[PDB]
Write an enzyme that holds these catalytic residues in place. Structure first.
Site, PDB file in Angstrom:
ATOM      1  N   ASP A  23       0.741  -1.241   0.000  1.00 33.94           N
ATOM      2  CA  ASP A  23       0.000   0.000   0.000  1.00 33.94           C
ATOM      3  C   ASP A  23       0.778   1.304   0.000  1.00 33.94           C
ATOM      4  O   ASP A  23       0.259   2.318   0.471  1.00 33.94           O
ATOM      5  CB  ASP A  23      -0.877  -0.045   1.257  1.00 33.94           C
ATOM      6  CG  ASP A  23      -0.052  -0.293   2.514  1.00 33.94           C
ATOM      7  OD1 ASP A  23       1.207  -0.298   2.415  1.00 33.94           O
ATOM      8  OD2 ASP A  23      -0.630  -0.477   3.608  1.00 33.94           O
TER       9      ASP A  23
ATOM     10  N   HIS B 187      10.811 -10.861  12.381  1.00 34.54           N
ATOM     11  CA  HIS B 187       9.385 -10.998  12.694  1.00 34.54           C
ATOM     12  C   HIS B 187       8.689 -11.818  11.592  1.00 34.54           C
ATOM     13  O   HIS B 187       7.942 -12.769  11.874  1.00 34.54           O
ATOM     14  CB  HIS B 187       8.767  -9.602  12.782  1.00 34.54           C
ATOM     15  CG  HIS B 187       7.283  -9.594  12.967  1.00 34.54           C
ATOM     16  ND1 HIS B 187       6.693  -9.537  14.212  1.00 34.54           N
ATOM     17  CD2 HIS B 187       6.269  -9.594  12.069  1.00 34.54           C
ATOM     18  CE1 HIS B 187       5.380  -9.500  14.073  1.00 34.54           C
ATOM     19  NE2 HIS B 187       5.095  -9.535  12.784  1.00 34.54           N
ATOM     20  N   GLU B 188       8.931 -11.454  10.336  1.00 33.06           N
ATOM     21  CA  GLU B 188       8.316 -12.176   9.224  1.00 33.06           C
ATOM     22  C   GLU B 188       8.729 -13.635   9.200  1.00 33.06           C
ATOM     23  O   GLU B 188       7.904 -14.513   8.922  1.00 33.06           O
ATOM     24  CB  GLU B 188       8.669 -11.535   7.881  1.00 33.06           C
ATOM     25  CG  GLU B 188       8.092 -10.131   7.671  1.00 33.06           C
ATOM     26  CD  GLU B 188       6.582 -10.078   7.884  1.00 33.06           C
ATOM     27  OE1 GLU B 188       5.885 -11.054   7.523  1.00 33.06           O
ATOM     28  OE2 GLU B 188       6.093  -9.055   8.406  1.00 33.06           O
TER      29      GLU B 188
ATOM     30  N   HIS C  94       6.710 -15.782  11.278  1.00 32.98           N
ATOM     31  CA  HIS C  94       5.502 -16.236  10.588  1.00 32.98           C
ATOM     32  C   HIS C  94       5.849 -17.390   9.617  1.00 32.98           C
ATOM     33  O   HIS C  94       5.131 -18.392   9.530  1.00 32.98           O
ATOM     34  CB  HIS C  94       4.860 -15.098   9.802  1.00 32.98           C
ATOM     35  CG  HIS C  94       4.234 -14.034  10.656  1.00 32.98           C
ATOM     36  ND1 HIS C  94       3.537 -14.318  11.811  1.00 32.98           N
ATOM     37  CD2 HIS C  94       4.146 -12.693  10.486  1.00 32.98           C
ATOM     38  CE1 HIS C  94       3.046 -13.200  12.315  1.00 32.98           C
ATOM     39  NE2 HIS C  94       3.399 -12.199  11.530  1.00 32.98           N
TER      40      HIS C  94
ATOM     41  N   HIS D 275       0.820 -14.024  15.836  1.00 33.35           N
ATOM     42  CA  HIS D 275       1.117 -12.905  16.718  1.00 33.35           C
ATOM     43  C   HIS D 275       0.969 -13.218  18.201  1.00 33.35           C
ATOM     44  O   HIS D 275       0.057 -13.959  18.626  1.00 33.35           O
ATOM     45  CB  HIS D 275       0.230 -11.724  16.353  1.00 33.35           C
ATOM     46  CG  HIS D 275       0.684 -11.009  15.123  1.00 33.35           C
ATOM     47  ND1 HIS D 275      -0.175 -10.327  14.296  1.00 33.35           N
ATOM     48  CD2 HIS D 275       1.916 -10.896  14.568  1.00 33.35           C
ATOM     49  CE1 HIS D 275       0.504  -9.830  13.276  1.00 33.35           C
ATOM     50  NE2 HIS D 275       1.773 -10.163  13.420  1.00 33.35           N
TER      51      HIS D 275
ATOM     52  N   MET E 252       7.226 -11.209  18.109  1.00 36.64           N
ATOM     53  CA  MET E 252       5.999 -11.514  17.379  1.00 36.64           C
ATOM     54  C   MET E 252       4.782 -10.679  17.756  1.00 36.64           C
ATOM     55  O   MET E 252       3.659 -11.020  17.390  1.00 36.64           O
ATOM     56  CB  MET E 252       5.664 -13.005  17.477  1.00 36.64           C
ATOM     57  CG  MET E 252       6.754 -13.910  16.899  1.00 36.64           C
ATOM     58  SD  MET E 252       7.297 -13.398  15.202  1.00 36.64           S
ATOM     59  CE  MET E 252       5.768 -13.424  14.269  1.00 36.64           C
TER      60      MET E 252
HETATM   61  C1  LIG Z   1      10.007  -6.019  18.458  1.00 30.83           C
HETATM   62  C2  LIG Z   1       8.861  -5.758  17.483  1.00 30.83           C
HETATM   63  O1  LIG Z   1       9.220  -6.319  16.208  1.00 30.83           O
HETATM   64  C3  LIG Z   1       8.387  -6.238  15.111  1.00 30.83           C
HETATM   65  C4  LIG Z   1       8.934  -6.156  13.786  1.00 30.83           C
HETATM   66  C5  LIG Z   1       8.080  -6.079  12.650  1.00 30.83           C
HETATM   67  C6  LIG Z   1       6.652  -6.079  12.798  1.00 30.83           C
HETATM   68  C7  LIG Z   1       5.768  -5.998  11.606  1.00 30.83           C
HETATM   69  C8  LIG Z   1       6.182  -6.400  10.332  1.00 30.83           C
HETATM   70  C9  LIG Z   1       5.093  -6.239   9.378  1.00 30.83           C
HETATM   71  C10 LIG Z   1       3.959  -5.735   9.998  1.00 30.83           C
HETATM   72  S1  LIG Z   1       2.438  -5.447   9.165  1.00 30.83           S
HETATM   73  O2  LIG Z   1       1.692  -4.401   9.860  1.00 30.83           O
HETATM   74  O3  LIG Z   1       2.652  -5.243   7.739  1.00 30.83           O
HETATM   75  N1  LIG Z   1       1.515  -6.798   9.327  1.00 30.83           N
HETATM   76  C11 LIG Z   1       1.956  -8.096   8.760  1.00 30.83           C
HETATM   77  C12 LIG Z   1       2.787  -8.855   9.837  1.00 30.83           C
HETATM   78  O4  LIG Z   1       2.375  -8.832  11.025  1.00 30.83           O
HETATM   79  O5  LIG Z   1       3.800  -9.454   9.452  1.00 30.83           O
HETATM   80  C13 LIG Z   1       0.730  -8.888   8.240  1.00 30.83           C
HETATM   81  C14 LIG Z   1       1.032 -10.378   7.896  1.00 30.83           C
HETATM   82  C15 LIG Z   1      -0.190 -11.122   7.318  1.00 30.83           C
HETATM   83  N2  LIG Z   1      -0.733 -10.383   6.154  1.00 30.83           N
HETATM   84  C16 LIG Z   1      -1.035 -10.933   4.990  1.00 30.83           C
HETATM   85  O6  LIG Z   1      -1.692 -10.442   4.076  1.00 30.83           O
HETATM   86  O7  LIG Z   1      -0.492 -12.242   4.838  1.00 30.83           O
HETATM   87  C17 LIG Z   1      -0.841 -13.015   3.673  1.00 30.83           C
HETATM   88  C18 LIG Z   1       0.348 -13.006   2.714  1.00 30.83           C
HETATM   89  C19 LIG Z   1      -1.211 -14.455   4.079  1.00 30.83           C
HETATM   90  C20 LIG Z   1      -1.093  -8.969   6.412  1.00 30.83           C
HETATM   91  C21 LIG Z   1       0.094  -8.180   7.013  1.00 30.83           C
HETATM   92  S2  LIG Z   1       4.132  -5.441  11.673  1.00 30.83           S
HETATM   93  C22 LIG Z   1       6.099  -6.160  14.122  1.00 30.83           C
HETATM   94  C23 LIG Z   1       6.951  -6.239  15.260  1.00 30.83           C
HETATM   95 CA   LIG Z   2       3.407   0.001   3.045  1.00 25.31          CA
HETATM   96 ZN   LIG Z   3       3.296 -10.189  11.996  1.00 25.53          ZN
END
Ligand SMILES: CCOc1ccc(-c2ccc(S(=O)(=O)N[C@@H](C(=O)O)C3CCN(C(=O)OC(C)C)CC3)s2)cc1
Ligand SMILES: [Ca+2]
Ligand SMILES: [Zn+2]
Ligand SMILES: CCOc1ccc(-c2ccc(S(=O)(=O)N[C@@H](C(=O)O)C3CCN(C(=O)OC(C)C)CC3)s2)cc1
Ligand SMILES: CCOc1ccc(-c2ccc(S(=O)(=O)N[C@@H](C(=O)O)C3CCN(C(=O)OC(C)C)CC3)s2)cc1
Ligand SMILES: CCOc1ccc(-c2ccc(S(=O)(=O)N[C@@H](C(=O)O)C3CCN(C(=O)OC(C)C)CC3)s2)cc1
Ligand SMILES: [Ca+2]
Ligand SMILES: [Ca+2]
Ligand SMILES: [Ca+2]
Ligand SMILES: [Ca+2]
Ligand SMILES: [Ca+2]
Ligand SMILES: [Ca+2]
Ligand SMILES: [Ca+2]
Ligand SMILES: [Ca+2]
Ligand SMILES: [Ca+2]
Ligand SMILES: [Ca+2]
Ligand SMILES: [Ca+2]
Ligand SMILES: [Ca+2]
Ligand SMILES: [Ca+2]
Ligand SMILES: [Zn+2]
Ligand SMILES: [Zn+2]
Ligand SMILES: [Zn+2]
Ligand SMILES: [Zn+2]
Ligand SMILES: [Zn+2]
Ligand SMILES: [Zn+2]
Ligand SMILES: [Zn+2]
Lengths: 164, 166, 164, 166
Positions: B76, B119-120, B123, B129, B137
């Protein structure tokens, strides 16, 4: 911490759906009644509750289209593919698309919208196909009481809700 | 009947990854180091091991992209969605995509690549989460400003509940 | 009133491009130099001016990807399709995509990024393929002076700019 | 060499259209009337004629959709983009898509379907945007509140420069 759940399923019992557009084949009320009944098939045997949204983002976005319509599963004209739905998940997860090159009806002619939708919503909720030829989730359309195999399948994911 | 069973965890401990392309924001070397460090966060506390492939298909395909980039989960622009990854499984399973409309860095500026990747990858390995605000997470990104990173106990617990200790 | 122009072409001489991401195969500066030179091939014989944008929306969005990457033309792994670009127009119009399953180089090995890009930008600007085997817009890659057929083609769309 | 020549106008005067699907905002009958009236705006002042098909491929395929709907020119929710149409030609050429995240009406509320369709069909037939603020083909939507619509002279001029008078 949280690990992902064992199967694809909605993590909430309250789900929304939106009829984005309509087929030329039936009136708006006929379509609305067909989908309302298709969702009741599932809510009658689980704790699921469905609320229709008229606009905005719903968990289950329903639409009618032809050929390429916004995903990796283009439709193919009359016959062949009839509709498809995505398993529970974010964005397109749960959405249901119907091929408008088919003739949708509230009868035995063409393809019965209620029946196809009930089957598609099973996918939207987490059920894949059944080997049981009498099951709603059997992979082939044949022209209401939800079969027992589909009841066992949907309840294995969401429980029975009120058994009364 | 059949449901859609989910792959709760990778069935093998030796995984491969491939950096398909690179962001304009950092050097190739900086990107490679950030991802290596991010995988090590998890391999350090489990029997998991990661191997980098330079061609072909790897279990975890990593790439940078913007807006609609091939999976119909479009990014986005600046802010909002940062990146996303698919849970364990074949094909797209395990893959991680980073929104290149974000500014990726090896510091506190923009978003720290290493931290977001770590973080990713959580997943990618089967972690959803956490509700613990101090966990890697947790859903909200925060940056400590420190040069060292220590995987919080909640994440150690979660990952080990799936793969056991190292 | 205004009718559409006779051929697909940009209605402005000042165009922007953005290198969205980079290939693992070459350094950032090598890639930047290859694209800068590929655009100069065309600007040297027309009134076109290209300005690089580091972020945001550029007329010509350049990216490297593999397989499905956001359009109806998925790449196919090593060899086969090398890259593609869309003709002038809004949104994806003008954009150029390179298959990162190929090995991009600033040499005679693998596929020369400068040469492939120069060809792709011809498409981005409105040229289709030429029957001339010595033309840059010939449909088959073979490993700089812009051939005359490509000069005549690009100038038929934009004029010669300063002929000096 | 070869360029990408554009089809300046339809080579036949008898065109077909098909309403592929319908918006939730109006009755089927209201939608059909709005589109018929929109085509008549153009057929009234040229040798063009339009025929509605109920199945198969028609020259001008009409449909309602939201966000990414099959052509990678995604809509954007309420407001902003209202609809778009492709210039004359095969396949998608001539087709018109309406953003169903807009509220379509037969009045001044939301966007008047007839008026927007008439404008889109101008594009479907080969007209680009006019610079005359009073033209149907001007880029900005405005609604008069009147029950009758008269094609401005600028649009009559433009369309007739392509197809001649009726
Ligand atoms: C010390 C703290 O450390 C962290 C570091 C990074 C994050 C985040 C990385 C990315 C995001 S996000 O807001 O872009 N949300 C994504 C995520 O949580 O990874 C989600 C994943 C699932 N999504 C999705 O569409 O997945 C599909 C491909 C199945 C939507 C976005 S928060 C959070 C905490
Ligand atoms: Ca973005
Ligand atoms: Zn996440
Ligand atoms: C009393 C028995 O009741 C029924 C009622 C309807 C059906 C069918 C509805 C649609 C079809 S289909 O032939 O069009 N196949 C689709 C389906 O089975 O839903 C599939 C879904 C998976 N596909 C797909 O594209 O997946 C995407 C959504 C991930 C391809 C088409 S059979 C079957 C039985
Ligand atoms: C001294 C001669 O110099 C050259 C340099 C490069 C090329 C080529 C670059 C890419 C290819 S290709 O084999 O990958 N074909 C693509 C192309 O020719 O650009 C086509 C473009 C049209 N396609 C497509 O998907 O169109 C979309 C963009 C609308 C399919 C692939 S040949 C040819 C000659
Ligand atoms: C008395 C005045 O009457 C009117 C009635 C309607 C309009 C408009 C309808 C739609 C819009 S828009 O803001 O959504 N822009 C579109 C348009 O002008 O039709 C454009 C078309 C080209 N686009 C596009 O992406 O086309 C692709 C499919 C080639 C972008 C949106 S303004 C303007 C004047
Ligand atoms: Ca119930
Ligand atoms: Ca079909
Ligand atoms: Ca959904
Ligand atoms: Ca139909
Ligand atoms: Ca994978
Ligand atoms: Ca970036
Ligand atoms: Ca010049
Ligand atoms: Ca290839
Ligand atoms: Ca573009
Ligand atoms: Ca490569
Ligand atoms: Ca058409
Ligand atoms: Ca809109
Ligand atoms: Ca609407
Ligand atoms: Zn679909
Ligand atoms: Zn099915
Ligand atoms: Zn992605
Ligand atoms: Zn592409
Ligand atoms: Zn080419
Ligand atoms: Zn469209
Ligand atoms: Zn317009």
């Amino acid at each position: 911490y949280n690990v992902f759940p064992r199967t694809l399923k909605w993590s909430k019992m309250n789900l929304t759906y939106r009829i984005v557009n309509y087929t030329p084949d039936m009136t708006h009320s006929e379509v609305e009644k067909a989908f309302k009944k298709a969702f009741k098939v599932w809510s009658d045997v689980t704790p699921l509750n469905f609320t229709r949204l008229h606009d905005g983002i719903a968990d289950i976005m329903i639409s009618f289209g032809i050929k390429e319509h916004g995903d990796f599963y283009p439709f193919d004209g009359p016959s062949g593919l009839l509709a498809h739905a995505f398993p529970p998940g974010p964005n397109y997860g749960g959405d249901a698309h119907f091929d408008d090159d088919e003739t949708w009806t509230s009868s035995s002619k063409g393809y019965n919208l209620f029946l196809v939708a009930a089957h598609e919503f099973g996918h939207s909720l987490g059920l894949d196909h059944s080997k049981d030829p009498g099951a709603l989730m059997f992979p082939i359309y044949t022209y209401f009481m939800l079969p027992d195999d589909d009841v066992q399948g949907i309840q294995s994911l969401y429980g029975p809700g009120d058994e009364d």
